[PDB]
A paper describes a structure:
The m1G37 modification also prevents the ribosome from shifting out of the three-nucleotide mRNA codon frame (‘frameshifting’) to ensure the correct polypeptide is expressed. The absence of m1G37 in tRNAPro causes high levels of +1 frameshifting on so-called ‘slippery’ or polynucleotide mRNA sequences where four nucleotides encode for a single proline codon. To address this question, here we solved six 70S structures of tRNAPro-CGG in the presence or absence of the m1G37 modification and bound to either cognate or slippery codons in the P site. We further show that ribosomes bound to mRNA-tRNA pairs that result in +1 frameshifts promoted by tRNAPro-CGG result in large conformational changes of the 30S head domain, consequently biasing the tRNA-mRNA pair toward the E site.
We next solved a 3.9 Å structure of tRNAPro-CGG lacking the m1G37 modification (G37 Δm1) and interacting with a cognate CCG proline codon in the P site. Although the m1G37 modification was previously shown to be critical for high-affinity binding and decoding of the cognate CCG codon at the A site, its influence on the overall conformation of tRNAPro-CGG in the P site appears to be minimal as the tRNA adopts a P/P orientation. Notably, the mRNA remains in the 0 frame with three Watson–Crick base-pair interactions between the codon and the anticodon. Similar to the structural studies of the ASLPro in the 0 frame, the mRNA used in these studies contains an additional nucleotide after the P-site CCG codon. The mRNA has clear phosphate density for the single A-site nucleotide indicating the mRNA remains in the 0 frame. The absence of the m1G37 modification correlates with a slightly weaker U32-A38 pairing when compared to modified tRNAPro-CGG. These structures suggest that the absence of 1-methyl modification on G37 alone is not sufficient to destabilize the tRNA in the P site of the ribosome.
Author numbering:
A (entry chain R7): 1 to 47
B (entry chain RD): 2 to 273
Write the structure that this text describes.
RNA sequence: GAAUGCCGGCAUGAGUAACGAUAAAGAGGGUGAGAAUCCCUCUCGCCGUAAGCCCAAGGGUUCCUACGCAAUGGUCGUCAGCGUAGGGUUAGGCGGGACCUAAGGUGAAGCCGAAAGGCGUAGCCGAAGGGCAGCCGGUUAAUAUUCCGGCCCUUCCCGCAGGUGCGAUGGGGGGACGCUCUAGGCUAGGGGGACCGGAGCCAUGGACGAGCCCGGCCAGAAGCGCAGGGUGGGAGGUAGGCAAAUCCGCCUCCCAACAAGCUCUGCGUGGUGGGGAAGCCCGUACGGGUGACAACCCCCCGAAGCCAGGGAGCCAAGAAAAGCCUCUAAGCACAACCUGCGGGAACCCGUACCGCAAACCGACACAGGUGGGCGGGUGCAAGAGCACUCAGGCGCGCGGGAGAACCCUCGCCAAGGAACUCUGCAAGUUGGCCCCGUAACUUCGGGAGAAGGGGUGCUCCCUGGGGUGAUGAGCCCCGGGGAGCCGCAGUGAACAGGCUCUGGCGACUGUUUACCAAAAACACAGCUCUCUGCGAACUCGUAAGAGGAGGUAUAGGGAGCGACGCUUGCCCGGUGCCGGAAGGUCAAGGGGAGGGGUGCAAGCCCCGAACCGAAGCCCCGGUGAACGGCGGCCGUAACUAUAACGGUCCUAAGGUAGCGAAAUUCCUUGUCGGGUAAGUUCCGACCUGCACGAAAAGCGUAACGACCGGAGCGCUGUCUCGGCGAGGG
RNA sequence: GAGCUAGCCCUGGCCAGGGUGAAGCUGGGGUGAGACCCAGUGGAGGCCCGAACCGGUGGGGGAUGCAAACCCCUCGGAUGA
RNA sequence: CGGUGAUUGGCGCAGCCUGGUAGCGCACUUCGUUCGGGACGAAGGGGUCGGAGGUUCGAAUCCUCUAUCACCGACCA
RNA sequence: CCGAGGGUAGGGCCCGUGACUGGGGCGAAGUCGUAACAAGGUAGCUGUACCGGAAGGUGCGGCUGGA
RNA sequence: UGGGAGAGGGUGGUGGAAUUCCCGGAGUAGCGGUGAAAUGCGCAGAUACCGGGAGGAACGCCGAUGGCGAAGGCAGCCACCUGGUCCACCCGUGACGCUGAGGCGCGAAAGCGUGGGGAGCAAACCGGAUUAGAUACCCGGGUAGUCCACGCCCUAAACG
C-alpha cells in the first residue's frame, strides 16, 4: 500500500532546511551538536 | 410563503427551503465598498476552539453599515433586497441621493423604491433610524446600539424585534427578544420595525448534508465517548450519565448560571 | 561451558523448499572459446481506456557510442538499466524568476512574556490560481515549439513623422469566478465512396471485375466569409468613491433600443512552406532509396474541446491583487504620453533519460501504491463496459521431461434434489434489450425489475417518420406490416439480478476499530432542557491575543434523545441546580476588657475575652426531556380456582398507559396454537415480568440494509457418494 | 516529526453510458374567483442500474507469501456527508 | 453451601440495642341506634412471645444449636 | 389459425375453521358500591377531553326534558 | 329612485374599571378559607393602604321576554371594507318562479398540527378536610386549555 515516504523537495527543504533550523532556538542547538560531532551534512541534502 | 417538497426521495418530505419572492432581481452583488474576502476559519492561531465547525459553502462577506450616523439627514432610495449568506436575515441595498451605496439589514415590510432617512428628524416609518430618546414608547424597533457611537449590536437576527417600554432619565428601558428588560442610553441609534424573514424559524433542514453545507460538522455526544474524552463517556453499554450532566471540561450544563456576578452592566438590567 | 550472553567464523535442514503471476512458445541463419537465454529472419501467442503514446511529481547518468563479463541479473549470458572511457541536455515566444496576490509565514508601528520567546494593522514572501509574446516541418547515434527552413508575434532603448494637457505605489472600472441542465455554429476525432493517385496480385474450384490491398493531409500572416462575446450615445446638476478629478456613483429631461455601429476572440479560406502509404530493393542493432511530377477530391457521424465572461433553472449564494482602460495630484508643460516607422538591446535557471514502472515510494529487476491529457476500428441498445483487432509494445531473466498420491485453479455427471452443515458456507439457477402483466402495505413518492410470462437469428416484399443535403438522389438514425429458411439452442461467444413470505434492531444516504469486529455501534435531520444582552456565554493561551464572529435570542455554547405517528404517569426524603438583603457557624483584619516580660522610671515588646466582621456550609422554598426511585403481609364472591373489595405495616412516592418467556425469562424445551413425518430455533397467543417500561425514552411504523433469525419455490458435487478430464505445482 | 494517518484552510482537477420524469411553465378542463384535475414541456434528487475512481461484505488461496494487509471470484458508494 | 434479618392475641406491627410494665389498629363478644343490617356510641375478653439449654435474684428482652421463612452471594476460568 | 380441457403463475369474492381476546344477551336469590327517579341528598341531560375498580367525577360550551 | 334600523361579518387602531405580578413609601401579629376547620401564606415585614410600572383576558351601567343573522352565533369605542333586510314612490324587465338527490360552502364548545402569548379561571395532578372507604361534592395549589395567526377536525339537548 501507500508507504510512509513520499518525497517532496519543497517539504524537505522547508522542514529540515538550514533556514528553518536557524529560526527556532531548538534548531540552533541541533546544528551546534552536529558541528561539535563533526557531521559532514549539517542539514539534509536537498537539490 | 415557505416552500415544501414532494417525497420523491427520502429526506425531501421534510426538506424545507425559504421563500425568495422578497428577493428582487439582484442575484449578484455590488462591489468595492461591498464584499470583502471572508476568512474561513474553524479555529484560532493553532488548536480548535469552537468544535464541529468547518466545511460549508464558500462565502463573501457583505459589509453592512451598522452605524447610520455617517449620513444624518441624508435621504435614501431602496433599490434592491438581496440574500446574505452570513446572516439569517435579508439585506437591503440603499442608493443615496448623496451617491453612496450601502447595505442595511432589511426590515419587515420594506418594499423596493422607498424613501428612508436617518437622524433625529427621521419620521416614524419602517427602516428609519433615530436615537432611542426620540422614538415613541410602544413601537417595535431593531438594530439597537448598546452603548452610543459603538454600532448596532442588538436584535439583528431574522424575525426578531425589540420593544421600547419607557424612558428613565437619560436611559430608556427595552423589551429585548429574550424578555430581558434593559436600560439603554437614549442617544443610541436603532432602526424602527421588525427585521422580517420570520419564516426562518420554520425551516427544516431535511437531511444531514444541509447541515454540512452551512458549515456545521457532526455533533458527537459525550455519552458516546470514553472517560478520557468526556465525563459522560465510558461504562458498558448506555450509561445513564452517572453524575450531574456536565460539559467536557467539567462544568455542569443543566441550570448552572455563569454570568459574571460583579459585572458593571448588572445595574442596567432588570429581567431575565 | 553454560547467562534464549556479545562479536566473528563454520556446520544442520539439504542438494531439499524456492527460482517472484498458466499471456507460450518453435525453427533457421549469424557472432562467439563457450549459446534455450545475444542479433536477424519466418511461424505462434498476449495487451490493446493498455501491458500504447504525451506531461507533472520523484530519481540524478540510468540517454548514445565503443571496449568488456570478476561481481549485480534468483539459471545461462557474447546481453544490460552493470564495469571502463568518450560523447550527449543549445530558448525573448515551452516552464520558473527580474509581474500579482490567497491560505499560511514573516513582519517596521504597537501589545505581551522570568529568559529563550508569543501576538500583530500596513508592507514583503508565499502558486498547477490570475497575467504574458510561436505554429508546422527537417536534421543527431544521442537535443529540439531550444539547432536549421518557412511564415508570425512581445517587451524595452534611441531617433526622426504625426496627435493629446502629460502625469502616480492615489481614485474608479475591469480582472471577477457557484452547481446542474442546455441552444447555435465550428474544430478535434472517426466512417464510407462508383471519384483521384499507386508498386503490384488472380493463388485452390470460381472471379479482369464500380475486383483485392495502401493512401487521399498539416501549418499558414493581412484581408474577406461564417459563428459568437463585451458594451448604449449626448446634455446639465452633484454634498459620495477619506486631497483633487472631465472618471465612477446618484438625479433630470433628450435620442437608441437595437448588438444597428465599435471593438475582441474562435473557425474556415488565404501569399507561401512542408508531409506523403502499402509493396519492392537493400548493408548495419536501426534506417535509406524507389513507388510519386503522388493524388491530396466528395459525402456522413460528431464531441466533455472552441466561440467563453453563452442561455435557462436552483440554493447551499459561489477569492484577492497586478497586468489593462480612465481620472486627476503635486511636478511638468524646450518635458512627457499615444499612434506609425526605422535601427539597436532582449538576462539567470530547467530542458538528457525512466516516468502505472527494472530508473519514484515499498531493504529486491517485489503480482502492491502513484496526479493530469490522447486513447482508433467492428459488433453487442449505449458506453472509458465486454470479445477480437490497427498504431505501438510484450511473451513477464531458469529450462527440458514425465503424466503417482495429494494441493490449487477449472470443466462435466446417472438417480435423488439441502438428506451435508452452525447456517444452502461455497458453488450452482436467474441474468441484456423490447412488449404483456404485477399483491399485501403505504408517509400515495413507493413497494416495481414485485412476482410470472412471451419475443430475441437470417432472406425476400411492402410501408411511416426524421437529420444533412434545395423541397430530390445518396449517407445516417429511428419504426411498422406480410411471406419464408435453418439449427438442439438466435443478448447462439464475452460482459449482465435467483425469487418470495415472515420477524428482530436501526428510520433512512452515510462513518468507524489502516492491520481479525462495518454492526443493533457513531453520525444524521428533528425534539427537549440549560447557559449566554456582547468587551457576550464557552475554548486555547501566564499574558497579549485569537476563535466564537467581523455573528447578536429565528443567534451562539453545553447536554441527552435520535425521521415520523400516538405518548412520555407519581415521588424534591437525600444529591445537583435555581431563588431567598432573617438567623446559626465561619478566616484575615478591626477591637481592646485583662494579663505577662524587662527597665529607676518615661517607655519598649508579647499574648489576649466580649463585640464588628464575606463567600461557603447549616436553614427555608422551587425544580425530573436534572442525579435518581417508583412496596410487604393477611382475608374476602351463588363448586373449586381466582380476587373486583377490605384490613394492616412502611415509604418521599409505592410502575399509570403501552409491551412482555422478549437482544430482557434462572427454573425453561413454561403452557397452548401454527409451519414439520419429526421444530431446545421461528411465528401467533396466555402472563407465573428471578430481573420491561416512557427522552440511558415506550409502543408502532411505509421505505431502506454486503446486519441478524425462521420458512417456502426454483437450481445445484452441499450431501448419499463419489467418478473422470484439463492446466499450475 | 501531520512527506503515513485524522481534521481544517487556500487553489485546481475528476465522476463513461443509460433509467425514473419532482417543482415550475404552456394549452385544455373546472369555479363566481379559486382550490384542484388532464395532457405536453420541463430535468429536480445525501434517486436507481452500472464503468473510471473510493472501498473492503462473504468465500477460497496466501502463511520463512508477490506482499510486515497481497491475489481470484463476489459485493458497497458512485452529483455528493 | 456461605453471610444477616425476623418468628410476638384470629390477622398486620410496636415492646428488645439501655433486662423487672407485653401495647396499637382491625377483628370477636355484650349493651346502645335503626323497622332491620352496615356505619356510629359505651364497656369487655383475648398473647406456652417457634422450641431446647445457661446467664442471673430474675429473660419476649442476653448468649449457643436445630426448625422453617425472607433476602443477598456463589466470582477468574 | 381457432379450439374443449389439462398445466404453471398471480389476483378478487364467499364459506367453514383456528390457540386466544374483546364486547353482547340470558341465567341461582353471589361480591362491591349509590350513579340516576323527589332539590335523588353535587339539578339532570348532552358533544368533547382527561382521570378513576365501577357506576361515574371534573373541565369547556350547550338544553328545560329543573328551579 | 330615495330613505331607515341593527351585538350581521372581516381588518386595523384605541379607552378605562377590576385581577395578578414588580418596585417605593407607610404599617403592624396575623391573613386566606369553611358549616366548622385544616392545608396554605406571614416578623425573611404578609392581609389591609397609598403611589408608580408591566402584562393578559373580558367589556359594568346602557341592557330587556330588546335587536341582527340561514344556522352555529354576534355586546367598550373609532375608522375602513362588506352582506342581508324593512318602508315609500308605484318607475322598468316581463313568468325570469318554488323545492332540491348529489356536489359545494358555512358550522358552538372540547380536540390536533406549527409558532406566539399566558393576568385570571381551570380538566389532569398534588395536598387539607368529610366519609367506613372519596380517585368526588368543600378548601389551598397547579399543567395542558381558555387568547392570537394559519391549517385541520364536522360533533351536540346544532332545540321551536
Ligand atoms: Mg478593486
Ligand atoms: Mg472585491
Ligand atoms: Mg496566523
Ligand atoms: Mg503556527
Ligand atoms: Mg419547534
Ligand atoms: Mg449526536
Ligand atoms: Mg463506545
Ligand atoms: Mg482531548
Ligand atoms: Mg487523546
Ligand atoms: Mg473524567
Ligand atoms: Mg447496563
Ligand atoms: Mg456514564
Ligand atoms: Mg565460548
Ligand atoms: Mg557452569
Ligand atoms: Mg532461541
Ligand atoms: Mg532451546
Ligand atoms: Mg548442507
Ligand atoms: Mg536440482
Ligand atoms: Mg525432505
Ligand atoms: Mg522444487
Ligand atoms: Mg523471475
Ligand atoms: Mg562462427
Ligand atoms: Mg525532474
Ligand atoms: Mg549470474
Ligand atoms: Mg531479484
Ligand atoms: Mg564472445
Ligand atoms: Mg540503453
Ligand atoms: Mg555503462
Ligand atoms: Mg515576485
Ligand atoms: Mg506579493
Ligand atoms: Mg494576507
Ligand atoms: Mg511573529
Ligand atoms: Mg526580545
Ligand atoms: Mg497578517
Ligand atoms: Mg499560470
Ligand atoms: Mg508563456
Ligand atoms: Mg527558429
Ligand atoms: Mg491626463
Ligand atoms: Mg484600483
Ligand atoms: Mg481537419
Ligand atoms: Mg476514407
Ligand atoms: Mg486505383
Ligand atoms: Mg481455379
Ligand atoms: Mg472630493
Ligand atoms: Mg438585439
Ligand atoms: Mg484552413
Ligand atoms: Mg483568416
Ligand atoms: Mg517516401
Ligand atoms: Mg522498411
Ligand atoms: Mg454536422
Ligand atoms: Mg451565462
Ligand atoms: Mg499589490
Ligand atoms: Mg527536451
Ligand atoms: Mg524529452
Ligand atoms: Mg495514466
Ligand atoms: Mg532508486
Ligand atoms: Mg528497486
Ligand atoms: Mg525480472
Ligand atoms: Mg512492481
Ligand atoms: Mg489511479
Ligand atoms: Mg476522451
Ligand atoms: Mg473515446
Ligand atoms: Mg479500443
Ligand atoms: Mg458502435
Ligand atoms: Mg449494450
Ligand atoms: Mg475492456
Ligand atoms: Mg502489432
Ligand atoms: Mg517469472
Ligand atoms: Mg463435452
Ligand atoms: Mg448428479
Ligand atoms: Mg440429470
Ligand atoms: Mg426437485
Ligand atoms: Mg432448514
Ligand atoms: Mg440435516
Ligand atoms: Mg444430518
Ligand atoms: Mg451464496
Ligand atoms: Mg416487500
Ligand atoms: Mg423481471
Ligand atoms: Mg425461434
Ligand atoms: Mg443487475
Ligand atoms: Mg428477510
Ligand atoms: Mg425487513
Ligand atoms: Mg441504518
Ligand atoms: Mg478491521
Ligand atoms: Mg477506512
Ligand atoms: Mg491491529
Ligand atoms: Mg421525533
Ligand atoms: Mg489561561
Ligand atoms: Mg474577540
Ligand atoms: Mg472572524
Ligand atoms: Mg444549542
Ligand atoms: Mg442513545
Ligand atoms: Mg427527589
Ligand atoms: Mg431537590
Ligand atoms: Mg425539598
Ligand atoms: Mg444557593
Ligand atoms: Mg488580632
Ligand atoms: Mg481575630
Ligand atoms: Mg490584635
Ligand atoms: Mg455569610
Ligand atoms: Mg418524567
Ligand atoms: Mg369458594
Ligand atoms: Mg417462547
Ligand atoms: Mg415465544
Ligand atoms: Mg427481565
Ligand atoms: Mg405442532
Ligand atoms: Mg400438526
Ligand atoms: Mg411445538
Ligand atoms: Mg409471558
Ligand atoms: Mg429499557
Ligand atoms: Mg431517564
Ligand atoms: Mg430508540
Ligand atoms: Mg417495538
Ligand atoms: Mg421506533
Ligand atoms: Mg418495521
Ligand atoms: Mg449503509
Ligand atoms: Mg435458517
Ligand atoms: Mg481427478
Ligand atoms: Mg492435471
Ligand atoms: Mg493531509
Ligand atoms: Mg451521466
Ligand atoms: Mg407537467
Ligand atoms: Mg444516487
Ligand atoms: Mg450502482
Ligand atoms: Mg479520465
Ligand atoms: Mg470485515
Ligand atoms: Mg444507492
Ligand atoms: Mg479471566
Ligand atoms: Mg342517589
Ligand atoms: Mg343528585
Ligand atoms: Mg347526577
Ligand atoms: Mg378529578
Ligand atoms: Mg355546564
Ligand atoms: Mg307601466
Ligand atoms: Mg332554495
Ligand atoms: Mg367546528
Ligand atoms: Mg375552540
Ligand atoms: Mg391550539
Ligand atoms: Mg385558582
Ligand atoms: Mg380546586
Ligand atoms: Mg333550546
Amino acid at each position: 500500500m501507500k508507504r510512509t515516504w513520499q518525497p517532496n523537495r519543497r517539504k524537505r527543504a522547508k522542514t529540515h532546511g538550514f533556514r528553518a533550523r536557524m529560526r527556532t532556538p531548538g534548531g540552533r542547538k541541533v546544528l551546534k551538536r552536529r558541528r561539535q560531532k563533526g557531521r559532514w551534512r549539517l542539514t539534509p541534502a536537498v537539490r | 410563503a415557505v416552500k415544501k417538497f414532494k417525497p420523491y426521495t427520502p429526506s425531501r418530505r421534510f426538506m424545507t427551503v425559504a421563500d425568495f419572492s422578497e428577493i428582487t432581481k439582484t442575484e449578484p452583488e455590488k462591489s468595492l465598498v461591498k464584499p470583502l474576502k471572508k476568512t474561513g476559519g474553524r479555529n484560532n492561531q493553532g488548536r480548535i476552539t469552537v468544535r464541529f465547525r468547518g466545511g460549508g459553502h464558500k462565502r463573501l462577506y457583505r459589509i453592512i453599515d451598522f452605524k447610520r450616523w455617517d449620513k444624518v439627514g441624508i435621504p435614501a432610495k431602496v433599490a434592491a433586497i438581496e440574500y446574505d449568506p452570513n446572516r439569517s436575515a435579508r439585506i437591503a441595498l440603499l442608493h443615496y441621493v448623496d451617491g453612496e451605496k450601502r447595505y442595511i439589514i432589511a426590515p419587515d415590510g420594506l418594499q423596493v423604491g422607498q424613501q428612508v432617512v436617518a437622524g433625529p428628524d427621521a419620521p416614524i416609518q419602517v427602516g428609519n433610524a433615530l436615537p432611542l430618546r426620540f422614538i415613541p414608547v410602544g413601537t417595535v424597533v431593531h438594530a439597537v446600539e448598546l452603548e452610543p457611537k459603538k454600532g448596532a449590536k442588538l436584535a439583528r437576527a431574522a424575525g426578531t424585534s425589540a420593544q421600547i417600554q419607557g424612558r428613565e432619565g437619560d436611559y430608556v428601558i427595552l423589551r429585548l427578544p429574550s424578555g430581558e428588560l434593559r436600560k439603554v442610553h437614549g442617544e443610541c441609534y436603532a432602526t424602527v420595525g421588525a427585521v422580517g424573514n420570520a419564516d426562518h424559524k420554520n425551516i427544516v433542514l431535511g437531511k444531514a448534508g444541509r447541515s454540512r453545507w452551512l458549515g456545521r460538522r457532526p455533533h458527537v455526544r459525550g455519552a458516546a465517548m470514553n472517560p478520557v474524552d468526556h465525563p459522560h463517556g465510558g461504562g458498558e453499554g448506555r450509561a445513564p450519565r452517572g453524575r450531574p450532566p456536565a460539559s467536557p471540561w467539567g462544568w455542569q450544563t443543566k441550570g448552572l448560571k455563569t454570568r459574571k456576578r460583579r459585572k458593571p452592566s448588572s445595574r442596567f438590567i432588570i429581567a431575565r
